[PDB]
Design a protein around this nucleic acid. Structure first.
Ligand SMILES: [Zn+2]
Ligand SMILES: [Zn+2]
Ligand SMILES: [Zn+2]
Ligand SMILES: [Zn+2]
Lengths: 79, 72
DNA sequence: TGGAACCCAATGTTCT
DNA sequence: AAGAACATTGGGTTCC
């Protein structure tokens, strides 16, 4: 396809195992490598689009996980 | 306690009892015009920590708590 | 009390 | 591809 599977913006290729845009790529890396201690102000089902993806990092990080992102995807595609 | 984010207040600002962070947010919201979109259901929880998540919902309840720049 | 000017945390792009 | 590090935004406290 051509759209990020997390936020629907224009994907820039496959990162951490998932067709995503560049903003979701570095968001995930940051969330996964530090704490991801986020709280949703809604009911854990926020809509995450190009502009709203900024509102709710809890729900953004859940959609990254749901789309299959994982740090070791490179090492894992091998074998 | 902030009538908006229920943190605790520095005093009465723009017509309402609010925290300092809500003071500046409002001034900025009203002046800068931006158009904000809620990502939930137009009823987000607005508290000390979750404030920053939905400026649409934050700004809406500033308005509804009575905030207004001409409080003269 | 209202506002300026900080300062920092979080985002998204560049990297020639 | 991954990821440092740059640029910028939006935000809260300090100060005047
Ligand atoms: Zn994305
Ligand atoms: Zn959410
Ligand atoms: Zn407040
Ligand atoms: Zn909202």
């Amino acid at each position: 396809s051509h759209m990020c599977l997390v936020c629907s913006d224009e994907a820039s290729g496959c990162h951490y195992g998932v067709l995503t845009c560049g903003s979701c790529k570095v968001f995930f890396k940051r969330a996964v490598e530090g704490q991801h201690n986020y709280l949703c102000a809604g009911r854990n089902d926020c809509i995450i689009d190009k502009i709203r993806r900024k509102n709710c990092p809890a729900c953004r990080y859940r959609k990254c996980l749901q789309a299959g992102m994982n740090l070791e995807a490179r090492k894992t595609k091998k074998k």
